[PDB]
């Protein structure tokens, strides 16, 4: 089997991407944030505290003839940005782009943190990291991809995120028309539950490539590119007037600037992020100070190849017995 679904930016900045997902019978379609950095499929629901729902579409398990409460199961998750959610668990039929999994754990939120409530466009998350990170207790549950894998034509999914435009998540096949050149594959460590890999270096604009190992995770659920402070300083030094602002929380730059590109290495291959992809717009409405899309990871504990980086590539998440990642230009 295969599946193919369009993923759409939630706003004009590409702050996140939403993909329609069919849950239950008859189907209830919710727009979920596909997140290769986490492993829970959770949704706003008829059980979510009413004051914490503000425009989201909810899953109502009592209206699904295939929903079954997973007795005794609860979940609770905290994300790297400080947001969180928790609740109980159903199993139900879940379909993405024509690919169907029966008995998928659908984690129904009883509580969500303010950042989720305040984003009316995201109805939940669909985790695509390794199932070892799933938070369901006392019986950990499998991700959608893990449940589907054995049925897929090939045990892979691909992320093709657009810049200020829709893109595609495919399951079970590699669309050879969706990229240019070749796909370069690179080793993955699953020891932390992530799609963790080592980039071979970077360049700023037309500058020389610096060969250096940068370990990080391929994370579709993170907006920005978080890299070591040395790398980030080298980038922003090429933007006149750019500075790190403690009050804003990262590098900012004059909105009048033209940003240089940023290149990262995948083996001997090179992925070029155009400068425009690094502009996240005014820090507050009407400001002439703009927020940068490349930020230091120093306070995180891990480097993160988030959407800023991934949207410059066609990315293969290869879930073979020994997983690997593939990157192609497009
Ligand atoms: C440092 O991370 C960011 O700035 C990500 O910003 C957003 C992430 C998701 C949604 C929105 C707005 N609904 C903003
Ligand atoms: C704005 O959001 C972030 O910066 C995310 O931070 C992370 C920190 C550690 C691990 C992960 C991936 N589970 C994400």
Q: Which domains does the chain show, CATH number per domain?
A: 5-174 (2.40.70.10), 175-330 (2.40.70.10)
Point out the residues that are catalytic.
Answer: 35, 199
Distance CA 113, CA 106 (A): 19
Residues with CB under 6 A from ligand 1: 10-11, 15-16, 119, 223-224
Ligand 1 atom 13 nearest Cα:
119
User: 37: Cβ below 6 Å to ligand 2?
Assistant: yes
Q: Where are the beta strands (DSSP E) in 128-195?
A: 156-160, 167-171, 184-187
User: 88: Cβ below 6 Å to ligand 2?
Assistant: no
Which letter, b or e, does each residue of 89-121 get, where b requires 16 or more Cβ atoms within 10 Å of its Cβ? Answer: bbbbbbbbbebebeebbbbbbbebbeebbebeb
Distance CA 159, CA 311 (A): 8
Residue 297 Cα distances to 43, 291, 300, angstroms = 29, 16, 5
Q: How many residues does the chain have?
A: 330
User: Long-range contacts: 254-261, Cβ < 8 Å, 24+?
Assistant: 254/288, 254/289, 254/290, 255/281, 255/282, 255/287, 255/288, 255/289, 255/290, 256/288, 257/290, 260/204, 260/205, 260/206, 260/235, 261/204, 261/205
Distance CA 93, CA 107 (A): 13
- How are beta strands 289-292 and 84-96 bridged, if at all? unpaired
Burial class of residue 85 (count of CB atoms within 10 Å of its CB; 0-12, 13-18, 19+): buried
For the chain, the first-to-last Cα distance in angstroms comes to 25
How far from chain centre, in Å, is Cα 184?
20
Q: How far is the CA of 80 from the centre of ligand 2 (A)?
A: 4
Ligand 2, from 14, 40, 304, 309: best to mutate by most atoms within 8 Å of Cβ?
304
Burial class of residue 301 (count of CB atoms within 10 Å of its CB; 0-12, 13-18, 19+): exposed
Ligand 2 atom 5 nearest Cα:
80
The atom of ligand 1 lying closest to the CA of 118 is: 13
Q: Are 213 and 204 in contact (CB under 8 A)?
A: no
- Shortest CA distance to 192 belongs to which of 303, 299, 75? 303
- DSSP category for residue 93: E
Q: Which residue(s) pair with 94 in the sheet?
A: 23, 101
In 3-state terms the chain splits into helix, strand, coil percentages (rounded to 5) of: 10, 45, 45
Distance CA 109, CA 153 (A): 33
Tell me whether the omega of the peptide bond preceding residue 138 falls within 30 degrees of 0, making it cis. Answer: yes
Distance CA 220, CA 295 (A): 16
| Cα dihedral 179, 185, 187, 192 in deg (nearest 10) | 10
**What values do phi and psi take at 20, rounded to 5?**
-70, 140
Phi and psi based region of residue 120 (left: phi greater than 0; alpha: psi -120 to 50; beta: remaining) = alpha
Distance CA 117, CA 84 (A): 11
Distance CA 300, CA 81 (A): 9
Q: Where are the beta strands (DSSP E) in 98-195?
A: 99-112, 124-127, 156-160, 167-171, 184-187
Number of Cβ atoms within 10 Å of the Cβ of 138: 7
CB neighbour list of residue 138: distance below 8 Å, 6 or more residues apart: 72, 73
Burial class of residue 18 (count of CB atoms within 10 Å of its CB; 0-12, 13-18, 19+): buried
Distance CA 95, CA 56 (A): 19
**What values do phi and psi take at 151, rounded to 5?**
-85, -15
User: 135: Cβ below 6 Å to ligand 2?
Assistant: no
Distance CA 86, CA 124 (A): 12
Distance CA 119, CA 324 (A): 33
The atom of ligand 1 lying closest to the CA of 121 is: 13
Q: Which residue(s) pair with 313 in the sheet?
A: none
């Amino acid at each position: 089997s295969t599946g193919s679904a369009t993923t759409t930016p939630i706003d004009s900045l590409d702050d996140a991407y939403i993909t329609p997902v069919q849950i239950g019978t008859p189907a209830q379609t919710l727009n979920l944030d596909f997140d290769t950095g986490s492993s829970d499929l959770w949704v706003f629901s008829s059980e979510t505290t009413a004051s914490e729902v503000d425009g989201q579409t909810i899953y109502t398990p009592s209206k699904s003839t295939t929903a079954k409460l997973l007795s005794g199961a609860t979940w609770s998750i905290s994300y790297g940005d400080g947001s969180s959610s928790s609740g109980d668990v159903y199993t139900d039929t879940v379909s993405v782009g024509g690919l169907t999994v029966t008995g998928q754990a659908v984690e129904s939120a009883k509580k969500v943190s303010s950042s989720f409530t305040e984003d009316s466009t995201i109805d939940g998350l669909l985790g695509l990291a390794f199932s070892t990170l799933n938070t369901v207790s006392p019986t950990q549950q499998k991700t959608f991809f893990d449940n589907a894998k054995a049925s897929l034509d090939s045990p892979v999914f691909t992320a093709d995120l657009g810049y200020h435009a829709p893109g595609t998540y495919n399951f079970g096949f590699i669309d050879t028309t969706a990229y240019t050149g070749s796909i370069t594959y690179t080793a993955v460590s699953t020891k932390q539950g992530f799609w963790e890999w080592t980039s071979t270096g970077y360049a700023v604009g037309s500058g020389t490539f610096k060969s250096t190992s940068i370990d990080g995770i391929a994370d579709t659920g993170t907006t920005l590119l978080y890299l070591p402070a040395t790398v980030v300083s080298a980038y922003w030094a090429q933007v006149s007037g750019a500075k790190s602002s403690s009050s804003v929380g990262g590098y900012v730059f004059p909105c009048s600037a033209t940003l240089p590109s940023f290149t990262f290495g995948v083996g001997s291959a090179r992925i070029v992020i155009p400068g425009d992809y690094i502009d996240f717009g005014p820090i507050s409405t009407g400001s002439s100070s703009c927020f940068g899309g490349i930020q230091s990871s120093a306070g995180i504990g891990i480097n993160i190849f988030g959407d800023v980086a991934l949207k410059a590539a066609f990315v293969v998440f290869n879930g073979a017995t020994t997983p690997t990642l593939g990157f192609a230009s497009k």
